[PDB]
Nucleic acid binder design. Structure first.
Lengths: 95, 248, 58, 159
RNA sequence: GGUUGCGGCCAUAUCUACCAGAAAGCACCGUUUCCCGUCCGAUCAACUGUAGUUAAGCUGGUAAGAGCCUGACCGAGUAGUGUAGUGGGUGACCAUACGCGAAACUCAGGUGCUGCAAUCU
RNA sequence: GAAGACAUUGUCAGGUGGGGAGUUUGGCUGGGGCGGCACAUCUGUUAAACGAUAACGCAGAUGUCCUAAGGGGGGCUCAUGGAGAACAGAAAUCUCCAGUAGAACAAAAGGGUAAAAGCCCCCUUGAUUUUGAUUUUCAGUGUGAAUACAAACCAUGAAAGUGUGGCCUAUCGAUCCUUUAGUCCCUCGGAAUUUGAGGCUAGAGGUGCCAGAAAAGUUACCACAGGGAUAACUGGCUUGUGGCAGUCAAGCGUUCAUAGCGACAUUGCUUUUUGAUUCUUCGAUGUCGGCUCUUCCUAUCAUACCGAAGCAGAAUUCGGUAA
RNA sequence: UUGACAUUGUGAAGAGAUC
RNA sequence: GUGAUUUCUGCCCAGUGCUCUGAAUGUCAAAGUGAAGAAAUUCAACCAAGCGCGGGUAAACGGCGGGAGUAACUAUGACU
RNA sequence: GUCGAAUUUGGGUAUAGGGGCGAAAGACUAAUCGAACCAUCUAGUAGCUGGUUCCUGCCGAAGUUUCCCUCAGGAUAGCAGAAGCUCGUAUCAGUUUUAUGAGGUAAAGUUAAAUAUGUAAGAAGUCCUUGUUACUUAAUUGAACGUGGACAUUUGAAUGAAGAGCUUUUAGUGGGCCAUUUUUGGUAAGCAGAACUGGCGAUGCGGGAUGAACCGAACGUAGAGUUAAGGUGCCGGAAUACACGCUCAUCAGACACCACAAAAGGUGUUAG
RNA sequence: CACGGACCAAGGAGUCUAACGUCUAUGCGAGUGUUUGGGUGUAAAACCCAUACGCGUAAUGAAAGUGAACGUAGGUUGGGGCCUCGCAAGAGGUGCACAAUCGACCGAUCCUGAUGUCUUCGGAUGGAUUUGAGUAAGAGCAUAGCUGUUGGGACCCGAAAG
C-alpha cells in the first residue's frame, strides 16, 4: 500500500493532549539482547545432555506481517504506536 | 477408468499458466486418455488400464520436476482366478516455485552448491529447477529429489513485479555463455516523472537492455515479507532491486 | 465407521420437562446500558429529592 | 462448506418492498419513542447502520434506552430450555410502534368512563369482554321467501 | 375557489395526446459595473420590476387511452392445506368426516387527499 | 640404538559419525489408501412462508486490496437506443431528445443506492485517544466482525448534521519466549550511585491441524489389546447391469405386418452376472476347482403324443401339454 | 580427524607486523 | 563384488559416493587478539580441519531418452 | 542321497544376551530365538475385553449443544436424584379467543394461503395535583423519579393450576433405532442424511397364528360387573345369525401395516 | 447358527489414607483448636495444663504502598411477624431474613493538583459509561457422618514391551 510520511493525530504528552503533527516511520525488530531472562534460562537448559529441550517451530503459514507505524510528536518528542492491516507492499513514501 | 493421475501445484495462484503447457506437452507424447477434470490446484487425468498412467509420468518427469505417489483401491476379485482389479491413483506433485520468481535458499542448500547466494531467481524449470545469481551471475540447480527433502517455498510471486524504465547501462562484460553482466541505472515507471529516484542496480541481462526500454523486477525495499529465511540472512547483502524480465 | 452426527429429535421434549421458565422480571430493572448522560443527572435527581424531604422531614 | 454469517440467508428478508424503494419517508423520524413504549422490529434494508440481526425480524420489545439516533430494546430470546433477556441497539428506521397498546389504552379509558358513569347508575357494569356466544332464538318469516328445493347435479365432461 | 412558500401520506398524484385560464401570484424575460462562476453570464452568481409574452412552465378540462387504485355470495366455498380412519387403489393418487380458505383473469366504479402561514377582484 | 619439547597424555572446541541409541511417522472419510477440505471462514441454494436444521449435497468465493476506494461537502447523471457534423468507416470526437437504473459501486454471490451510496471536483486524516455496555456464531466462555452512546480532541460543511477505516454480509490468532511504546512510575530485600535485569499498561513477531505438539519410512519375520462400531468371505435386502418373457408393429421376407420377426420404445420377470449397502459372524461357519454321490426345479437338448408353415414326399422349422 | 590450554625445558635461522 | 572352462566384457564422471603430488583469501568455534566502556560486556578482524573450488574414478552405486531430417512405386533409413 | 573325504564321532577346550556363532536359513545358542534363561524394579500402563455378591419401597433418564491430535475417549450445558429454603392466593400454561406485527413455501400467474410464530388484555394500573436534577429547552418547557388525592374484585377475555418461587449438590448418558407426514443424495434398498410428532431402547398386557416398533391399552393384590382392538363352522370363549347382490376359478378368495405384481388381453358373467 | 457357563463346596471385587468442596449433627462462639510437649495415673486409657502456632476477625495492587459511617450504617419497591383501630372484612404503624435497584465508604488504574516547600518533594481537594475474590452491627474454628474429587496398586483380573 502507501501511507503519508506525516499525520496530525491526537497526541498525549502531558504537554499536548491535542491533535499535533507527527513523523511516521516504520517499526522494526530490535536486537535480540542476550542476558534477557528467557535467554539466560534457555542457555542453561540447553547445556549438558538431552538435546533440544524446547520446541522448534516449522509451522509457518502467514505470507505477510502486520505493519506498525512509529509516530513521534514533533514538539514534545513523545511517541506512539499504530497498526495497519496486513499487506504485501508497504511504503511510507509518496507517489 | 483403471487409473487416475492427480497433479497439484499448491500455489497462490501463479502456476495457473503452465497447466496450459502441460496439455501441450501432453499433446506431443500421444498414448491414449479418457477424461480430464480440473481440480483447484490442477488436473485430474483418467486412463484405461494401468499401463498408460505409467507412460504419462515417464514423460512427465523430463518436462517438469515432479514427485509421484501411488495408492490402490481393489474394486473386486474373482475368487476362482485369484485375479485382482484395482483403481490405481497416482498423485503427482510439483515444486511450488515458478520460473523467474524470487527464492531465498536455506544456508545449508546455498553452500552445498558453488556456495551460491541466498537471493536467487529461478531461471528455468525442467527436469531440474535452475537457479541464477541476479548479480554474481552464477549457475546452480536443485534436482527434484533434493527439493522434497527440505521443502522451502518461494519468497515472491511473478505477479508481484513492478515496471521499470532503464536510464543507462554500464557493462562489466562477464557472461560465460549467452549472458551479459552489466550495471544499470533504473527508475520506477510511476516514480520517474513526479519526483525522482535512481536505483543503480547490478544485474544480469546487460546486452538485452536498450536505453529507455521497459523492464520488470522485484522492488524489495517496498515489499513486505514474513518469510523466515529472509529475516535471518542480513539486511546489508540484499539488493534493493532485482531485474527480471523485459517488455517488448 | 461413520456416526450419526446431528439431530434435534427429543430436544424440544427435553426442553419442556422443566419447561421454558420466564424472565422473573423485576420492578426497577438494571440501568446497564442506559444513557450515561441521563444516568448522571438521574443520580443527582434522586440525590436531591431524598434531601428534599430532609428539609421537610425532621 | 457450510456458512453461517451475520446477515446470511436474508435474501428475501431485507428486500425493500416492490415500488417502495428509495428514500425513507420523514414521519419515521418525527416519531417519538419513550422508555416504557412497546415497539415492533421490521428491518429497513436500505439503512445499514443500526440494523438488527435476522432473528429479531418481527419481534416485539420494550424501550429501556433512548439515545441520539437509536433506541434500546429488550427482547426475550429462547435459547436451550430458557428465555434470555436481550438488549438491542437499533436506529429508528428499523422500529415502529405496535398498535396493541393504542387499542389497549382506548379500552382502558372507555372502561374508566363506563364505571364512573355507572357509579351513579347503580353498578351492573359488565366490564369484561366475553367470547362470541351461541346465537339466541329467532323466527324466520317465510312470507315473501319460499324455500327453493335444490338437488345434487349430474356429472359432465365439459372439456 | 384561485395563487405562493414549507409540507404530510407518496401514481385515485404517473404517463400520452388536445384544450382553456379573468384578477393576483408564480414563471418565461432584460442587463454584466460590484459578489461570484464558466470552453460559453446557458447553467449558478449579482442588478432592475423598468422595457415584453401568457408562447412554454405551471393550474384545470377532455380521452370506449396504456398505468394505478378501491369493491364484488366475481372466479369459488374452487385450488391448496391442517386434523381422522384396520377408508378405497397393485401402483400413481382419490373420496369421505371435522376445519381453514385463496390468487391471477374478468366485470363495475374511482383518477389525488390535506396541514400551518400569508396573499387576490 | 632410534626419536625428542615434536609424538603421547589430560581438559575444552569446531567438524565427521544409522556403527549405535531414544522417539515420532495428523483428523474427518459409505473399509483403509490417493484426492479433497465438508478442519477457521463468506454468499446463493439443499430448507418444507418466524428462528433453528445434516450429507465427501450443488454453484462459487476468502488468507488479499486501498492515503483513498477512508471522512465531510458540492455540482452533475449512467447502460442503451434514436436523429444530426470535414476526413470518420460496424464504434473516436461534438449536439439534442427519450431513457426506473437495463450502468457503476476493488473482489465471490445476494441485498442496497438516482439532486446518491454512482461520475467529477474541493478541503482533509475519525484508519485518532481512554476505556465500559450490547448484538452475532455461543457454554450466552475466548477469538474474529459489528452496533449504539459517554468523556476528550479533531476533519468537513454556510449550516443542520456527518465520520471511531472500506454502502452491508467474509478477509483472521492463546499461554511461554523475544521486542517496542507509554509513566519517566515499581523492585533488585544490610544503606546508596551509575549501568544491567525484572515488573505494571498497550502493541507487534505464530501457531492454516486456524481454542494453537517440535516429528520419515517399513514389515511377505512379526506382536499385543480389541472390533462384526469396519473390509476380504456365505446369507439377507435392492437390481443398476447381466440374463430371461410379453405388448404396438415402423419394417425384412417373390408378393404377404402377424410362415417367420422386429426397430422405435413401453410393461414385467430373473439371484447361475456384476454391483451397492455393511444387517449376522474376527474368545474363526475350514477358502478355488475337480472326484464321488443323492435329490428337487423347468426356462424341453433327445424320446412320447399333438398343433402350424409359403409342409407333395422327404427334410426342417415355430408353437402345445409334458420333468 | 583438527584447533587451543597444560605436560614443556635450552636457543639459533629464515621469512611474515606470527610462522 | 562376481562365480569352473571357452568367448567377450560397449557408451557414460552431470547426480550420489569415494579420492587428490591440487588450489583460493569465501564461510569458521574455543582460546589469543585490537578497539569502545568505570566494569560486567559489546564489536571488529584473524583462524585449523571440514565443506566450497578444480582433477581422477564405473569388474564404485548406477544410467544407457526425446525431438528431426535423408537411398529410383510404397517402404526400409547407413547420415546430418 | 552320500558313503575316503570341505567325512563321521567321543572327551578336553575357547567364544554369553543388543552378545556369541553362522558354506547365510534371521539359522543356531538346553522342547525357548526378528533379541535366551532366572529374580527384582512390578500389583508396570491400558481411553480396550470380562467380572462386580441381600431384599423391598419412592423417584427416574440419555445417545443432543460447544471445545479438544477430538471420532471405541473426556471437559461443558441439557435431561435426573437428593437436601432443603422463603412463602401460599398465586404468578403461571407444549391450549384457545379477541387485538395486533412479521413471513414469501403451496396454489395463482407482481399476488398470497393452511399449520406453526412475536406482543398485549392492567395495581409494576389509570386519571388528576405539586416537588427534585448539575441532563434537556428559546422558555416553569420536556424527560426520569417522586409527594398528595381518587378508582378495588366482571380488577378488565376462555379454560385450567397435586401451589408459587429459590438455591445448593451429584449420579448416569454423550454408539441410538423405528413409524407417520415432508425431503436431498442414490437406479433402487431392511441404504445414507435431515424436518415434525409418536413410540422402541427402558414395557409387560388383549389382538395381528408368529415378530423390539403396527391397532387397543400402559401394570399394587383380588372379587364381580362393562368394554377396547380383533372376532363369533371346528380347533377356540361368542349367531352353521338375519337382509340384499356378485363369483365356479385343469394353481378361486378370505381384513390394515405385511411379508408384493404390471401393460394390456377374455362371444367368462352381471350392471350401466 | 453371538460370548461365558458339566456339577458341587470353600475363597472372590469401590477399601484405607493425605489434602478439600457441598450437606447434617454437636460444643463454644469474635473467636476457636487440651494430646509437638509438660504434670499425673488403677499405666498405650482416663484426668489436668504454660507457651506459641494454625485458620478466622480486612480488603487491594505486580510492587513500593495505602486501608472502610455525609446519615438513627442511608433511600426506594416487595416482604414473614408483631402493634393500633375496627363486629368482622380489611386498612394503617413497624418491618428480620431475603430478592431487585440507586447511592456512601476502602484499595488499584486514568484525570484534576490546595494551604504549603531543603525547589521537586509533598498530595489537599474533586472527578470518572473504569476495576476487586471488598465495607456497609462480625460468623468462623474444631470433631464426627453421608456423598463427590485428586494422588497413591486405587473396584477386581489382564498386555505387546522397558
Amino acid at each position: 500500500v502507501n501511507v503519508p510520511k506525516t499525520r496530525k493525530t491526537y497526541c498525549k504528552g502531558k504537554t499536548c493532549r491535542k491533535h499535533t503533527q507527527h513523523k511516521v516511520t516504520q517499526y522494526k525488530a530490535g536486537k535480540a539482547s542476550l542476558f534477557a531472562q528467557g535467554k539466560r534460562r534457555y542457555d542453561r537448559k540447553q547445556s549438558g545432555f538431552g538435546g533440544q529441550t524446547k520446541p522448534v517451530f516449522h509451522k509457518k503459514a502467514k505470507t505477510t506481517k502486520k505493519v506498525v507505524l512509529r509516530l513521534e510528536c514533533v514538539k514534545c518528542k513523545t511517541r506512539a504506536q499504530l497498526t495497519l492491516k496486513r499487506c504485501k507492499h508497504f511504503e511510507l513514501g509518496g507517489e | 477408468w483403471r487409473a487416475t493421475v492427480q497433479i497439484r501445484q499448491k500455489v497462490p495462484h501463479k502456476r495457473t499458466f503452465l497447466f496450459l503447457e502441460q496439455l501441450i506437452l501432453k499433446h506431443n507424447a500421444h498414448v491414449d486418455t479418457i477424461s480430464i477434470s480440473e481440480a483447484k490446484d490442477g488436473l485430474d487425468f483418467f486412463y484405461a488400464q494401468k499401463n498408460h498412467a505409467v507412460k504419462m509420468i515417464d514423460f512427465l518427469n523430463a518436462v517438469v520436476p515432479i514427485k509421484h505417489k501411488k495408492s490402490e483401491e481393489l474394486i473386486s476379485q474373482d475368487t476362482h482366478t485369484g485375479a485382482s482389479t484395482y483403481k490405481f491413483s497416482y498423485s503427482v506433485e510439483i515444486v511450488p516455485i515458478c520460473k523467474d520468481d524470487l527464492v531465498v535458499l536455506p544456508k545449508k542448500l546455498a553452500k552445498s552448491m558453488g556456495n551460491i547466494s541466498q537471493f536467487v531467481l529461478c531461471s528455468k524449470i525442467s527436469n531440474t529447477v535452475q537457479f541464477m545469481d541476479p548479480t554474481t551471475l552464477q549457475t546452480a540447480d536443485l534436482s527434484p529429489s533434493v527439493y522434497w527433502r527440505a521443502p522451502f517455498n518461494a519468497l515472491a510471486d511473478v505477479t508481484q513485479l513492478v515496471e521499470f524504465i532503464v536510464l543507462d547501462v554500464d557493462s562489466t562484460g562477464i557472461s560465460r555463455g549467452n549472458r551479459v553482466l552489466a550495471d544499470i541505472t533504473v527508475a520506477r515507471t510511476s516514480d520517474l516523472g513526479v519526483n525522482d529516484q535512481v536505483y543503480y542496480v547490478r544485474s544480469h541481462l546487460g546486452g538485452i537492455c536498450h536505453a529507455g526500454d521497459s523492464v520488470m523486477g522485484y522492488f524489495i525495499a517496498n515489499s513486505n515479507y514474513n518469510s523466515d529465511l529472509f529475516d535471518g540472512l542480513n539486511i546489508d547483502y540484499v539488493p534493493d532491486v532485482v531485474l527480471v524480465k523485459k517488455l517488448y | 465407521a461413520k456416526s450419526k452426527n446431528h439431530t434435534a429429535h427429543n430436544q424440544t421434549r427435553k426442553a419442556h420437562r422443566n419447561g421454558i421458565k420466564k424472565p422473573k422480571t423485576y420492578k426497577y430493572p438494571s440501568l446497564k446500558g442506559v444513557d450515561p448522560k441521563f444516568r448522571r443527572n438521574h443520580k443527582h435527581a434522586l440525590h436531591g429529592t431524598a434531601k428534599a424531604l430532609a428539609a421537610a422531614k425532621k | 462448506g457450510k456458512s453461517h454469517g451475520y446477515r446470511s440467508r436474508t435474501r428475501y428478508m431485507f428486500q425493500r418492498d416492490f415500488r417502495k424503494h428509495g428514500a425513507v419517508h420523514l414521519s419515521t423520524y418525527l416519531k417519538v419513542y419513550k422508555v416504557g413504549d412497546i415497539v415492533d422490529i421490521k428491518a429497513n434494508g436500505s439503512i445499514q447502520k443500526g440494523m438488527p440481526h435476522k432473528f429479531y425480524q418481527g419481534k416485539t420489545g420494550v424501550v429501556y434506552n433512548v439515545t441520539k439516533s437509536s433506541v434500546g430494546v429488550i427482547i426475550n430470546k429462547m435459547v436451550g430450555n430458557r428465555y434470555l433477556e436481550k438488549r438491542l441497539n437499533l436506529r429508528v428506521e428499523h422500529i415502529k410502534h405496535s398498535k396493541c397498546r393504542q387499542e389497549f389504552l382506548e379500552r382502558v379509558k372507555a372502561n374508566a368512563a363506563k364505571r364512573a358513569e355507572a357509579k351513579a347508575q347503580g353498578v351492573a357494569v359488565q366490564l369484561k369482554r366475553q367470547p362470541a356466544q351461541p346465537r339466541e332464538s329467532r323466527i324466520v318469516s317465510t312470507e315473501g321467501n319460499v324455500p327453493q328445493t335444490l338437488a345434487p347435479v349430474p356429472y359432465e365432461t365439459f372439456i
